Amino acid sequence: GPCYNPDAEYLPASFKGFSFDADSSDSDHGRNGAEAEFVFGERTGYADLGIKIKSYQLRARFQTNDHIAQTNAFIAVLESPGPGLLVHPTRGTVFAACRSARVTDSKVDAAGVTYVELDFVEANSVLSGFGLVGNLVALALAPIITATEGSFKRHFSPDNIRYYNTEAVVSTMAQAVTQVQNAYLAISGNDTSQDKWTTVRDFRNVLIDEFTFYSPANAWNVLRNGFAILDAAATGSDKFNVLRNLINWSSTHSDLDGESGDAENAIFTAVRVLSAAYLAKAYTETAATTVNEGLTQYDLIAAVLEQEAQIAKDDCHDNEFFLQIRAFAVDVARVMVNRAYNSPSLIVYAFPGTVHGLVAAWEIFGDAKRSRDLEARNNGSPWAVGPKIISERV
Amino acid sequence: CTVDVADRRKRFWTTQIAACGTSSDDCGDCARPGLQLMCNGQGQVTVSTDNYAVGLALNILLTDASKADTGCGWTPGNRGGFWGDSFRSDNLRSGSKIRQVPTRTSMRETVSLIRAYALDDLKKLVTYGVAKSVDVDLTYRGSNKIDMTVIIQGVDGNESRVGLTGERISNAWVWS
Amino acid sequence: CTVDVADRRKRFWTTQIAACGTSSDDCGDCARPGLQLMCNGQGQVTVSTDNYAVGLALNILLTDASKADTGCGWTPGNRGGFWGDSFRSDNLRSGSKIRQVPTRTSMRETVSLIRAYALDDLKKLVTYGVAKSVDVDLTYRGSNKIDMTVIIQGVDGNESRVGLTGERISNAWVWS
Amino acid sequence: DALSDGFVRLCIDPSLNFFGEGCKILVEGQMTDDGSATPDAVTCVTSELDIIERFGQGSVLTESLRKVFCTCKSGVSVYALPREDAAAGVKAVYTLTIAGPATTDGRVQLYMGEAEYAVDIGVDAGDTATDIAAAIVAAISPDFPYAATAAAGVITLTARNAGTIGNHLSVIYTNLGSCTSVTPEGVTVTFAQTTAGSVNPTPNDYATVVNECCFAVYVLSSDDTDWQENLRDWIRSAWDCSKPQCFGHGYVFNKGTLGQVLADGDNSAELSRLALPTTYPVLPYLTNAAYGALSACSTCNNPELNIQGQTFGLLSCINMPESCTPGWTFGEVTQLQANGFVVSGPSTTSGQGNYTSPYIYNDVTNYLRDEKNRPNATFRDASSRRLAAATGVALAEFLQQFNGLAVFTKNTNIRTGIIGTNPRLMLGKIRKWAQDNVGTLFSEFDNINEDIQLLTDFEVQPKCVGQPGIFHLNMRYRPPVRGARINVNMAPALFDNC
Amino acid sequence: DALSDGFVRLCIDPSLNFFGEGCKILVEGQMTDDGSATPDAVTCVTSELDIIE
């Protein structure tokens, strides 16, 4: 332009606090990938592998009666340990580390001026260790199961309850294990491998025995292992109805009094909390078809967990299990909410008037074969979907 | 046996120039192409199947291709094209984009732009294997009038020439 | 069900221009932004939640950010910023630094500096995913007076356009 | 603030909406007595939440406005001109008879006006006609411009505003006489139109209400051709040569059969009629307001953008169910295209039922002949009109540098040091400005040597009649041209001769 | 409208000749009784619209 003020448009350069005047400004951006050249073929491939590390190159000048002292100070600054903040005249503030600094300084040819050729590299911080990001795509069911073990073994001792109630309590325990067994037998179905053939025999050998459930250790091991085997039998939706029935079975309360009722209620609470946890893990294993659907599933599970916490807090039964349930509830909240809102980023496209499935898919994505995807979320005849169409982000 | 020399391959319906008659509008006479119905001795109408290459050229010129991605966006239903392109295997699009020229002053530049677009779109005739040297002769500037004669170079159904540089079109059975 | 579409996400309170009214000081009338309390039919006041993007822009412009390291240093308590930035995961700073311009002669240069600073700060509106095309038009030199008109390009809560170069930002539910 | 630290001092403007206040759109229409706004006086309208209280509930204006707000959220500032209802106006009354009784459960669905007034109720078995009418009247949205009442199975719909504007609801879209999956079996509906419209207001007072209060777009929510003629006279007198101009443009409609619509037109170059058929489902002023609002709100700083096409001319706030016949037949569509009429059609082909959205073809004005009866197409495109206004203002702001400048005619030899000029140098500078705006305001040109003329008053008036300082600038331009008229000449070639 | 001052006065009018009358031609012919022009009198014609009546 004709009225372009340079020094009112270029930023005064400085590195790591020390300011200086720059004479040039470069950059080395890029995008690195592979290049496929299949033999005997008239075709070529490419694969984007990441970001090419940025590098800046400058040229500083020193033309002053004390340029020697300025250059010495600048050398002392550039050799400081660790990367620091750089003000590139045309890219603003970055974090770079000096990599080379040639200092040209002649006498019988040009005395008075000193030039420095500088070479910086984008140096981003790190996090010592293995820079291990979190895991907020998945539930960890170990802490809640340990807390359930604690709260179960605290209130269950069929050797410390009145003699006219031990048989009743133990029969209730065996009935719970029978429920878990029926759940597994209904969820496996057409599993022919001998592993079922054994697991069934193990369930029967545990149930037929008489002195197995008179010990809290054996009872808890049987319960946890039964739930784990029921988990490992199917994936996702298949384990919904089954688990929801279990939540209903253990939604009752005990009529015995004193310690006996506390033991039976410990049984029921263990079953209900383990079922809620494993139903959360089941919900997470399958993709949300609609934001309202994922949020409704989370509402169900959070309601169950809050009900259990209120039960475990009623007259200071155990404060500790209340706190544990509260923590697991906030964890299931973060995971289920992230699943409902962000697993596929569902958006509501607004079409003018209702349209076919193929046309809608092709206009949204540019790929009509994805029409099958628009049917699981939208209700409406295949030839008239809309005029508002839920789908994934692009 | 010896009868063989005649391909059992047939041709489907073909769109034709002035199939539905001209349409005067005081600016001139257009063509209004469509499908030609050929009658018989005793009722029994039938769609015509002649001029295959010109049929493809009309199918190409007179159908809008996909628009280019702008920051403004397009209405979900206005972005042109055909969903049937999601299933072809030749990795191409269907239609032309002569009606998507970014109009500008100095109509010579507009003429050059329309030439480039028409030639890029009609090259699909050669790419499909129906013609060999399609070419346009768009030449005028007027006020807005423009003449765009098109030549579709074809072959015959029997290779009568030996030692050619190229390679017989793959669909020389339409007679191009 | 079919009456689904309503993002169950809500909006918290928002700071608003002139919520606490203007403050005349004989040089002009400023705005004094704060929180607007909406009354009801029967008592029961409630804080308004309109104009989210302008509220974020106010929270950005009217909050001093951490100052740069100098040789003399700063008082332990004047170095700007917010301690709450030690817990966010996006690795960014909270506030603006237009009040930290190293004032100089030739107010054209201070104009350019204030432009650079305000544009650098308000780029965080696009970075957080609340706007898409923020831009300023700071144009004056006067004696010291300056206009700084700010535009915050927004979207709607339903994608009504197809084939964009960019992407629906991240938070188009605030209506931007 | 004294408590601050630095020296750069921010002073936020008291209120927002700066971006607008340059695209004022005036909506004119009738109102009921519920409103508290003074009749026959323009008033600003800020937002949507306080129009029911100010312009009456369910009125024509509190329903057009609503569409002006739906169309574009921001960009313009709307001004209402509420008009009190006529003195001897009699409201139109349709009726709707429901005959039962029901035999199976189901839903009852109706579409009156537009999609925002639709109704959907539940009907069990054994419910009688009176109960169905009661539920329907209880479920009709109160903003529908028709007070609904029930009596023994007959629903009476009375227009809220008296006049002919009540005679534009005659395509009610029920769900009662078919086999949709949800249908009370044994119920039927019958439509009537018992009474009818009556006399309309004829204001003719624009000079007093808005005189130097220059607007950009005037939307008219009525169908009385005389009121449209008064509006046209206003905008025309605003495009005058005597007084300084406040260029504007008006949006009215004309509903009827083909002959009626072609008869309702004229050479009115200041209005953009919208031809609407006899069996239009939507109330006409709603879609008229949507079109006017989009036009006023999209072409603020882009005055060349043609509002037409499925993208730039889509009215998202109008939702129709499609119809077995396509309203205007194609012959009538071309007929209206020729006679300077705007035509709106459905965008997607969705099939019968199946809600859709109308869009605009040919964003053109109602101008087809010149002043001396010479067929023209200068002011046909509604964008050409906005371009003419913008070029007028741009040339007027450019020519301000000659105000008070010294001018040297009869010697054209400005001495060394004077800050004067002469007509030839001014002509050069003006002609450079003109061919500098080629592409934004003007077309290329045809012959710029005899298109731009700058004469002095001393050589236009007769001898000893001119005055010093006065000039005469004559410019002849053409707005930027778009598109072409290619003539394809396709021809195959079986022979080959390289 | 920022034109108030009174320095510049617009006259936007599409019907304005700039180059004088120019090149006067005279067309002599017979007419029917439907016309509204007085026979045997030279008149001026400006467009092809009013010629019919």
Query: What DSSP element (H or E) covers D474?
Result: strand D471-475
Touching subunits for chain C (3+ Cβ pairs under 8 A): A, B, D
Supply the DSSP symbol for D87.
S
Tokens of A60: 């500083």
- Report whether C160 contacts D316 (CB < 8 A): yes
Q: State the Rg of chain E over Cα.
A: 19
Q: How far apart are CA C7 and CA A340, in angstroms?
A: 11
Q: How far apart are CA C109 and CA D84, in angstroms?
A: 58
Q: In sequence order, which residues have a C-beta less than 8 Å from that of residue D341 and are 6 or more positions away?
A: D254, D261, D265, D273, D274, D275, D364, D366
**Residues of chain A contacting C157 with CB distance shorter than 8 Å:** 348
Touching subunits for chain B (3+ Cβ pairs under 8 A): A, C, D
SS3 helix, strand, coil % of chain B, rounded to 5?
25, 15, 60
CB pair distance less than 8 Å for B114 and D486: yes
Nearest-CA distance D321 → chain A (Å): 9
DSSP string, D132-185: HHHHHHHHS-TTSSEEEEEETTEEEEEESS-SGGGS-----B-SSSS--SS--T
DSSP string, chain C: -TT--S--------EETTSS---B-SS-B----EEPEE--SSS--EE----HHHHHHHHHHTSBPPPPP-SS---TTTS-S-GGGGS-SS----SB-GGG----SSHHHHHHHHHHHHHHHHHHHHHHTS-S--EE-----SSS-----EE-----SSB--BSBSS---S-GGG--
- Report whether D246 contacts D215 (CB < 8 A): yes
Tokens of C146: 């300056």
Query: How determined?
Result: cryo-EM
3-state secondary structure A347-367: EEEECCCCECHHHHHHHHHCC
CB pair distance less than 8 Å for C165 and B71: yes
Q: How far apart are CA C97 and CA C109, in angstroms?
A: 16
Q: How far apart are CA A371 and CA A380, in angstroms?
A: 13
Chain A CB within 8 Å of residue C72 CB: no
Beta strand D491-493 with B150-153: parallel, antiparallel or unpaired?
Answer: parallel
Per-residue burial over B106-140, b = 16 or more CB atoms within 10 Å of its CB, e = otherwise: ebeebbeebbebbeebbebbeebebbbebebebeb
Chain A CB within 8 Å of residue D244 CB: no
**Residues of chain B contacting C166 with CB distance shorter than 8 Å:** 71
Q: How far apart are CA B141 and CA B111, in angstroms?
A: 7
Q: How far is CA A73 from CA A19, A24, A25, A68, B61, in A?
A: 11, 21, 22, 9, 71
**Resolution as reported, in Å:** 3.2
Give me the residues paired with residue D255 across strands: D276
Q: How far apart are CA D341 and CA C148, in angstroms?
A: 44
Q: How far apart are CA C166 and CA A391, in angstroms?
A: 18
Q: How far apart are CA B103 and CA D485, in angstroms?
A: 13
Rounded to the nearest angstrom, the gap between the alpha carbon of residue A383 and the centroid of all alpha carbons in its chain is: 38
CB atoms within 10 A of CB D36: 10
Query: What DSSP element (H or E) covers D434?
Result: helix D423-436
Beta strand D320-322 with D353-356: parallel, antiparallel or unpaired?
Answer: antiparallel
Tokens of D126: 């054994």
Question: Which SS3 state, helix, strand or coil, does residue D81 take?
Answer: strand
Question: Which SS3 state, helix, strand or coil, does residue A40 take?
Answer: coil
Mutate which of C106, C162, C165 to disrupt the A interface (most A C-beta within 10 Å)?
C162
Closest partner residue to D372 among E3, E8, E47, by Cβ? E47
Q: How far apart are CA B46 and CA B40, in angstroms?
A: 8
**Residues of chain B contacting C165 with CB distance shorter than 8 Å:** 69-71
Question: Which SS3 state, helix, strand or coil, does residue D478 take?
Answer: coil
CB pair distance less than 8 Å for B83 and A362: yes
Q: How far apart are CA A27 and CA A248, in angstroms?
A: 65
- Tallying the residues shown for chain E, one arrives at 53
CA count, 13 A, side-chain hemisphere, A31: 3
Residue for token pair 């539910």: C173
CB atoms within 10 A of CB D295: 25
CB pair distance less than 8 Å for B146 and D484: yes
Residue ranges of D 299-338 with Cβ closer than 8 A to chain C: 316
- Report whether B74 contacts B55 (CB < 8 A): no
Q: How far apart are CA C91 and CA C46, in angstroms?
A: 34
Q: Which of A112, A123, A52, A51 is nearest to A86 (CA)?
A: A123
Closest partner residue to B75 among C162, C164, C165, by Cβ? C162
Q: Which of D395, D371, D496 is nearest to D452 (CA)?
A: D395
Tokens of A306: 């809050």
Q: How far apart are CA D297 and CA A149, in angstroms?
A: 66
**Residues of chain B contacting A360 with CB distance shorter than 8 Å:** 76
Chain A CB within 8 Å of residue C137 CB: no
Q: Which of D357, A8, A38 is nearest to C115 (CA)?
A: A8
Query: What DSSP element (H or E) covers D95?
Result: strand D93-99
Instruction: Tell me the CA end-to-end span of chain D in Å, nearest whole number.
Output: 87
Q: How far apart are CA D90 and CA D200, in angstroms?
A: 10
Q: How far apart are CA D412 and CA D414, in angstroms?
A: 6
Supply the DSSP symbol for D40.
S
Provide the strand spans (E) within A64-131: 84-88, 92-104, 113-122
Cis? peptide before D101, omega within 30° of 0:
yes
Q: How far is CA D197 from CA D87, D158, D221, D223, in A?
A: 13, 11, 15, 12
CB pair distance less than 8 Å for D347 and A387: no
Mutate which of E5, E13, E18, E53 to disrupt the D interface (most D C-beta within 10 Å)?
E18
Residues of chain B contacting D, Cβ within 8 Å: 17, 27-28, 51, 53-54, 57-58, 61, 72-75, 77-78, 98, 103-107, 110, 114, 138, 144-156, 175-176
**Residues of chain E contacting D397 with CB distance shorter than 8 Å:** 2
- Report whether D284 contacts D168 (CB < 8 A): yes
Q: How far apart are CA A357 and CA A372, in angstroms?
A: 8
Q: How far is CA C114 from CA A328, C128, C134, in A?
A: 49, 22, 16
**Residue at A277: amino acid letter:** A
**Residues of chain B contacting D483 with CB distance shorter than 8 Å:** 103, 144
Tokens of A146: 């340990």
Chain C CB within 8 Å of residue B100 CB: no
Is there contact between A and D if contact means ≥3 C-beta pairs under 8 Å? yes
Cis? peptide before A6, omega within 30° of 0:
no
CB atoms within 10 A of CB D498: 4
Touching subunits for chain D (3+ Cβ pairs under 8 A): A, B, C, E
Provide the strand spans (E) within D262-389: 275-276, 320-322, 343-346, 353-356, 358-361
Beta strand B150-153 with B135-136: parallel, antiparallel or unpaired?
Answer: antiparallel
- Report whether D142 contacts D57 (CB < 8 A): yes
- Phi and psi (nearest 5°) for B34? -170, -145
Mutate which of B86, B93, B94, B127 to disrupt the A interface (most A C-beta within 10 Å)?
B86
Q: How far is CA A180 from CA B162, B166, C59, in A?
A: 82, 75, 55
Q: Which of D382, D265, D281, D253 is nearest to D335 (CA)?
A: D265
Nearest-CA distance B88 → chain A (Å): 11
Residues of chain C contacting D, Cβ within 8 Å: 17-18, 22, 28-31, 33, 51, 54, 58, 61-62, 64, 78, 98-101, 103, 114, 149, 151, 156, 160
- Report whether D419 contacts D406 (CB < 8 A): yes
Nearest-CA distance D173 → chain B (Å): 25
A394 burial via Cβ count (<10 Å: 0-12, 13-18, 19+): middle
Q: How far apart are CA B176 and CA B129, in angstroms?
A: 9
Mutate which of B105, B111, B112, B140 to disrupt the D interface (most D C-beta within 10 Å)?
B105
**Residues of chain D contacting B158 with CB distance shorter than 8 Å:** none
* Helix spans in chain A (H): 67-78, 142-154, 163-188, 194-208, 216-231, 240-249, 259-284, 291-311, 319-342, 357-365
Q: How far apart are CA A128 and CA A132, in angstroms?
A: 9
**Residues of chain D contacting E17 with CB distance shorter than 8 Å:** none
Tokens of A364: 């949204």
Q: Which of D208, D231, D207, D370 is nearest to D288 (CA)?
A: D231
Q: At what angle do helices A163-188 and A240-249 cross, to 10 degrees?
A: 170
Question: Which SS3 state, helix, strand or coil, does residue A229 take?
Answer: helix
Instruction: Tell me the CA end-to-end span of chain C in Å, nearest whole number.
Output: 27
Supply the DSSP symbol for B80.
-
Q: Which of B50, B56, B16, B49 is nearest to B34 (CA)?
A: B16
Nearest-CA distance B37 → chain D (Å): 21
Closest partner residue to A388 among C5, C120, C162, by Cβ? C5
Q: How far apart are CA A391 and CA A374, in angstroms?
A: 6
Geometric angle at alpha carbon D332, from D327 and D337, rounded to 5° = 115
Tokens of D153: 């199975």
Q: How far apart are CA B107 and CA B142, in angstroms?
A: 9
Tokens of D413: 């030899």
- Report whether C2 contacts A381 (CB < 8 A): no
- Report whether B35 contacts B47 (CB < 8 A): yes
Q: How far apart are CA B74 and CA C162, in angstroms?
A: 5
CB pair distance less than 8 Å for D348 and A352: yes
Nearest-CA distance A369 → chain B (Å): 7
CB pair distance less than 8 Å for D494 and B53: no
Q: How far apart are CA D167 and CA D193, in angstroms?
A: 9
Tokens of D29: 């229409």
DSSP string, A47-77: EE---PPPEEEEEEEEESTTHHHHHHHHHHH
CB atoms within 10 A of CB D476: 17
Q: What is the largest CA-CA distance in chain A?
A: 112
CA torsion, points A201, A206, A208, A211, in degrees to nearest 10?
A: 160
SS3 helix, strand, coil % of chain E, rounded to 5?
0, 0, 100
- Report whether D373 contacts E50 (CB < 8 A): yes
Supply the DSSP symbol for D403.
T
Dihedral sign of CA atoms D385, D388, D392, D394 in order: positive
Q: How far apart are CA C168 and CA C158, in angstroms?
A: 10
Q: Which of D136, D129, D88 is nearest to D111 (CA)?
A: D136
Tokens of E20: 């004088």
- Report whether D284 contacts D67 (CB < 8 A): no
Chain B CB within 8 Å of residue D481 CB: yes
Supply the DSSP symbol for D442.
B
Give me the residues paired with residue A62 across strands: A114
